[PDB]
Write an enzyme that holds these catalytic residues in place. Structure first.
Site, short mmCIF file in Angstrom:
data_model
loop_
_atom_site.label_atom_id
_atom_site.label_comp_id
_atom_site.label_asym_id
_atom_site.label_seq_id
_atom_site.Cartn_x
_atom_site.Cartn_y
_atom_site.Cartn_z
N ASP A 41 0.97 -1.41 0.12
CA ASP A 41 0.03 -0.40 -0.12
C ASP A 41 0.47 1.62 0.19
O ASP A 41 1.66 1.38 0.77
CB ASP A 41 -0.40 -0.51 1.05
CG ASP A 41 -1.48 -0.98 0.77
OD1 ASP A 41 -2.13 -1.87 -0.38
OD2 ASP A 41 -2.39 -1.30 2.33
N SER B 269 -6.19 19.64 -3.03
CA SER B 269 -4.71 19.32 -4.00
C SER B 269 -3.94 19.94 -2.51
O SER B 269 -3.84 20.28 -1.49
CB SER B 269 -4.26 20.41 -4.46
OG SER B 269 -3.13 19.67 -5.03
N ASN C 173 -3.25 -7.47 6.57
CA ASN C 173 -4.44 -7.09 7.89
C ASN C 173 -5.00 -7.57 8.67
O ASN C 173 -4.69 -7.13 10.24
CB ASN C 173 -5.07 -5.26 7.20
CG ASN C 173 -4.49 -4.88 5.99
OD1 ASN C 173 -3.49 -4.81 5.83
ND2 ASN C 173 -5.75 -4.35 4.99
N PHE D 45 -6.32 0.03 -8.29
CA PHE D 45 -5.51 -0.73 -7.79
C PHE D 45 -4.54 -1.52 -8.96
O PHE D 45 -5.21 -1.70 -9.93
CB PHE D 45 -6.13 -2.04 -6.56
CG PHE D 45 -6.10 -2.78 -6.07
CD1 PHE D 45 -6.01 -2.61 -4.42
CD2 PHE D 45 -6.04 -4.37 -7.17
CE1 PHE D 45 -5.55 -3.99 -4.11
CE2 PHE D 45 -5.59 -5.18 -6.15
CZ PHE D 45 -5.34 -5.12 -4.76
N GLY E 256 -17.59 3.72 10.64
CA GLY E 256 -17.10 4.37 10.56
C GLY E 256 -17.57 5.02 12.47
O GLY E 256 -17.49 3.82 12.99
N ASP F 210 -10.38 -3.96 8.78
CA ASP F 210 -9.81 -5.35 8.66
C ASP F 210 -9.22 -5.56 9.80
O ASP F 210 -9.28 -7.26 10.22
CB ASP F 210 -8.68 -4.74 7.94
CG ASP F 210 -9.16 -5.62 6.49
OD1 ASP F 210 -9.59 -6.25 6.75
OD2 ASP F 210 -8.49 -5.10 5.42
N1 LIG Z 1 -13.48 8.05 13.81
C1 LIG Z 1 -13.14 6.74 14.22
N2 LIG Z 1 -13.30 6.46 15.07
C2 LIG Z 1 -13.62 5.11 16.32
N3 LIG Z 1 -13.79 4.07 15.97
C3 LIG Z 1 -13.70 3.91 13.83
C4 LIG Z 1 -13.38 5.89 13.37
N4 LIG Z 1 -13.97 5.03 12.23
C5 LIG Z 1 -13.33 3.84 12.24
N5 LIG Z 1 -14.07 3.01 13.82
C6 LIG Z 1 -13.99 1.56 13.92
O1 LIG Z 1 -13.11 1.03 13.05
C7 LIG Z 1 -14.71 0.07 12.28
C8 LIG Z 1 -14.48 0.36 10.84
O2 LIG Z 1 -14.22 0.88 10.24
P1 LIG Z 1 -15.05 1.60 9.16
O3 LIG Z 1 -14.54 0.72 7.82
O4 LIG Z 1 -14.87 2.90 8.37
O5 LIG Z 1 -16.41 1.57 9.01
C9 LIG Z 1 -15.85 0.70 12.88
O6 LIG Z 1 -17.41 0.61 13.30
C10 LIG Z 1 -15.29 1.53 14.21
O7 LIG Z 1 -15.43 0.11 14.78
N1 LIG Z 2 -0.33 21.70 -5.20
C1 LIG Z 2 -0.34 21.64 -6.22
N2 LIG Z 2 0.22 23.26 -6.75
C2 LIG Z 2 0.75 23.16 -7.50
N3 LIG Z 2 0.76 22.68 -8.93
C3 LIG Z 2 -0.28 21.21 -8.53
C4 LIG Z 2 -1.14 21.26 -7.63
N4 LIG Z 2 -1.33 20.29 -7.64
C5 LIG Z 2 -1.00 19.70 -9.15
N5 LIG Z 2 -0.66 20.89 -9.92
C6 LIG Z 2 -0.63 20.53 -11.10
O1 LIG Z 2 -1.72 21.03 -11.31
C7 LIG Z 2 -1.83 20.14 -12.86
C8 LIG Z 2 -3.31 19.85 -13.38
O2 LIG Z 2 -4.33 20.91 -13.27
P1 LIG Z 2 -5.39 21.54 -14.23
O3 LIG Z 2 -4.61 21.63 -15.36
O4 LIG Z 2 -6.04 22.29 -13.52
O5 LIG Z 2 -6.07 19.99 -14.66
C9 LIG Z 2 -1.04 18.87 -12.82
O6 LIG Z 2 0.11 19.45 -13.66
C10 LIG Z 2 -0.01 19.27 -11.73
O7 LIG Z 2 1.15 19.04 -11.55
N1 LIG Z 3 -9.48 -4.12 -5.43
C1 LIG Z 3 -8.87 -4.85 -4.51
N2 LIG Z 3 -8.73 -5.67 -4.42
C2 LIG Z 3 -8.24 -6.77 -2.94
N3 LIG Z 3 -7.13 -6.48 -1.74
C3 LIG Z 3 -7.82 -4.16 -2.40
C4 LIG Z 3 -8.59 -3.96 -3.04
N4 LIG Z 3 -7.97 -2.50 -3.19
C5 LIG Z 3 -7.59 -2.19 -1.84
N5 LIG Z 3 -7.58 -3.28 -1.15
C6 LIG Z 3 -6.93 -3.64 0.07
O1 LIG Z 3 -7.34 -3.21 1.03
C7 LIG Z 3 -6.51 -2.84 2.13
C8 LIG Z 3 -7.87 -1.68 2.88
O2 LIG Z 3 -9.23 -1.93 3.24
P1 LIG Z 3 -10.07 -2.04 4.58
O3 LIG Z 3 -9.51 -2.53 5.70
O4 LIG Z 3 -10.98 -2.64 4.23
O5 LIG Z 3 -9.41 -0.70 4.82
C9 LIG Z 3 -5.54 -2.06 2.31
O6 LIG Z 3 -4.37 -3.29 2.33
C10 LIG Z 3 -5.07 -2.65 0.49
O7 LIG Z 3 -3.66 -3.45 -0.32
MG LIG Z 4 -12.84 -3.10 4.34
#
Ligand SMILES: Nc1ncnc2c1ncn2[C@@H]1O[C@H](COP(=O)(O)O)[C@@H](O)[C@H]1O
Ligand SMILES: Nc1ncnc2c1ncn2[C@@H]1O[C@H](COP(=O)(O)O)[C@@H](O)[C@H]1O
Ligand SMILES: Nc1ncnc2c1ncn2[C@@H]1O[C@H](COP(=O)(O)O)[C@@H](O)[C@H]1O
Ligand SMILES: [Mg+2]
Ligand SMILES: Nc1ncnc2c1ncn2[C@@H]1O[C@H](COP(=O)(O)O)[C@@H](O)[C@H]1O
Ligand SMILES: [Mg+2]
Ligand SMILES: [Mg+2]
Lengths: 310, 310
Positions: free
Chosen positions: A11, A35, A51, A116, A221, A252
């Site tokens: 990752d 950005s 994980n 991915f 969450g 996870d």
């Molecule tokens: N902001 C947060 N504060 C406390 N626990 C969290 C939070 N986000 C995720 N978790 C814990 O991790 C679980 C999985 O998170 P999620 O995959 O984001 O639904 C949740 O049901 C919580 O138990």
């Molecule tokens: N925080 C940032 N500061 C300066 N340049 C950026 C930033 N984020 C993205 N860019 C640049 O913005 C361009 C895309 O902008 P746009 O032409 O408006 O789609 C890309 O070539 C990036 O390198």
């Molecule tokens: N399309 C996918 N298939 C399998 N694993 C994935 C994919 N996209 C993201 N992941 C994995 O998903 C994990 C995050 O999942 P979670 O624990 O639900 O937040 C990461 O560690 C990634 O490596």
């Molecule tokens: Mg998940």
């Protein structure tokens, strides 16, 4: 001995310190432009099986990862597994292909948008879950589609109960293949966005899903989780986070908790509270496996929150 | 001659073959999960000064890049600047530093969510637009904050008309410094999401902003653009794109059009139309500078779209 089926991946995570929701403007043709400044890169150890095994191992469970790596960049993951005491019995390494990599851009609401590169994960089906020795429980998580399907089929034929977490593999499924797997699943564990995706694809209601499995678990969450039977539903609290750094991996870790809870025959309340704890402890650290509480530390935090030891 | 102040960067673009607006579920704690298959990487030539100068140059305008690259990896960009005919007189290379690099996660609607490692861009203030000889028009685009403010100040005292396009660098500004820069600007060009973010921050309405500048230009993706200019308002049609591969850099292509038109004395309608065409040309390719139309083809496509030659 718990079989943990799912991606093993590298990752690269970019966490916006904020919430994408605050920056959506429907009225514009551009819905959101952000950005945000980030420092030097750091590749993490991840993948769903990776994980889940880590979280389970943190709890002092026995975790057997079943999944696929690629030989060119395998070693740093294999060495970590070795250093941690994780078995590589069902970790297959394929010569001359790259291991999965996830480019994850996210916020503090865990809105993961991932580019991915499946890599070796495309071959996940070379492992056969049925063949696994003396397995008490399993989980089938996001993986290659043929792998996910096969794993559910072989584990149900073996009468090995499993949690089914299609997570990020949902797009690979259709109505018919999602219904089949859910029919084979003992438990379903998804986040609330994934539940709705599942509801849509299956054409089933939550009621209709819950009727077919032993438990439907939906994480939301900071608002905790729901543990549904067809005869009751536990509302699981969120353990308030020390701070919020990165939710990548929270799903996870939570499933790490669940798996431990189930295998020890915890009541549904305690199982979910422990899962929720893992979720809270992870979110305080960058990446899926950067938290490293001791089991005594997990135990202390649990008793502080809930007034008993798991 | 045209001074182009802004970032020079390498772009890593992950374009969702789709639209984020279709996968949002507001009624859920998690607003959006996506995990989409990508081909392997391709470090692209990018950065706002790099993109704008490129577009102007395709048109046969004279583009002087003013930006900062990192010596560690500057050579590939510099050599291609050579190949294209782009002057390096104000492209300052900082010893033992990294060039800015962007990880851009996007969709066909140009909803760019970017993690930006600025490196050498943090030093952009070493260039002084006041020192740039024989410049008659300029643009100040996203760059390091000290660098952006400086250019705005130094161009105004030198009496150089300039377009101010703060785009991705808005979070660096406050009400006062943003109101200062608009006051110093002759023109402002931003996308529509940016225009509302500028209003919010300055506390000025869109009517109030247009009052303080000769032109306010608002781009609207597939909807084209608006040019507000004291003695009228132009609604620039979008040039229907051949195919929509990657919109990243569309804003910058558009600004090249505008800058060519202003310097060559086109009316607002015609200059905005060539602007619109440059973005339509770019979107048919992946990355911001992949597109390589000849002046003949630009000439042909303009007439096909608009019924005359500017
Ligand atoms: N902001 C947060 N504060 C406390 N626990 C969290 C939070 N986000 C995720 N978790 C814990 O991790 C679980 C999985 O998170 P999620 O995959 O984001 O639904 C949740 O049901 C919580 O138990
Ligand atoms: N925080 C940032 N500061 C300066 N340049 C950026 C930033 N984020 C993205 N860019 C640049 O913005 C361009 C895309 O902008 P746009 O032409 O408006 O789609 C890309 O070539 C990036 O390198
Ligand atoms: N399309 C996918 N298939 C399998 N694993 C994935 C994919 N996209 C993201 N992941 C994995 O998903 C994990 C995050 O999942 P979670 O624990 O639900 O937040 C990461 O560690 C990634 O490596
Ligand atoms: Mg998940
Ligand atoms: N999908 C599209 N089809 C045709 N032209 C486009 C498209 N997206 C952007 N453009 C052109 O490029 C300009 C800048 O795009 P944006 O930065 O998205 O506002 C727009 O004003 C259009 O003229
Ligand atoms: Mg003024
Ligand atoms: Mg822009």
């Amino acid at each position: 001995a718990t079989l943990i089926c799912g991606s093993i991946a590298y990752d690269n995570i970019m966490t916006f310190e904020g919430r994408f929701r605050e920056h959506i403007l429907p009225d514009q043709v551009h819905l959101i432009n952000l950005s945000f400044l980030v420092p030097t890169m750091r590749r993490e150890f991840g993948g769903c099986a990776g994980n889940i095994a880590y979280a389970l191992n943190l709890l002092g469970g026995d975790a057997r990862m079943m999944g696929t790596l690629g030989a060119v960049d395998a070693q740093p993951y294999l060495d970590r597994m070795d250093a941690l005491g994780l078995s590589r019995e069902y970790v297959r390494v394929l010569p001359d292909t790259y291991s999965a990599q996830a480019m994850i851009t996210t916020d503090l609401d865990n809105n993961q948008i991932t580019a991915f590169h499946p890599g070796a994960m495309m071959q996940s089906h070379v492992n056969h879950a049925g063949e696994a020795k003396d397995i008490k429980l399993a989980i089938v998580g996001p993986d290659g589609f043929q792998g996910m399907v096969q794993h559910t089929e072989e584990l149900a034929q073996a009468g090995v109960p499993f949690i089914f977490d299609p997570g990020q593999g949902l797009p690979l499924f259709d109505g018919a293949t999602l219904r089949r797997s859910i029919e084979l699943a003992t438990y379903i564990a998804v986040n609330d966005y994934e539940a709705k995706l599942v509801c849509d694809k299956t054409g089933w209601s939550e009621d209709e899903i819950a009727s077919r499995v032993q438990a439907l678990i939906i994480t939301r969450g900071e608002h905790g989780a729901t543990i549904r039977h067809r005869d009751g539903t536990e509302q699981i609290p969120a353990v308030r986070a020390e701070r919020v750094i990165d939710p990548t991996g929270c799903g996870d870790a939570f499933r790490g908790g669940l798996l431990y809870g189930i295998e020890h025959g915890f009541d549904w309340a305690t199982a979910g509270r422990l899962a929720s704890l893992m979720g809270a402890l992870k979110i305080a650290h960058q990446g899926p496996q950067t938290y490293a509480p001791t089991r005594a530390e997990i135990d202390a935090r649990f008793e502080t929150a809930f007034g008993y030891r798991p």
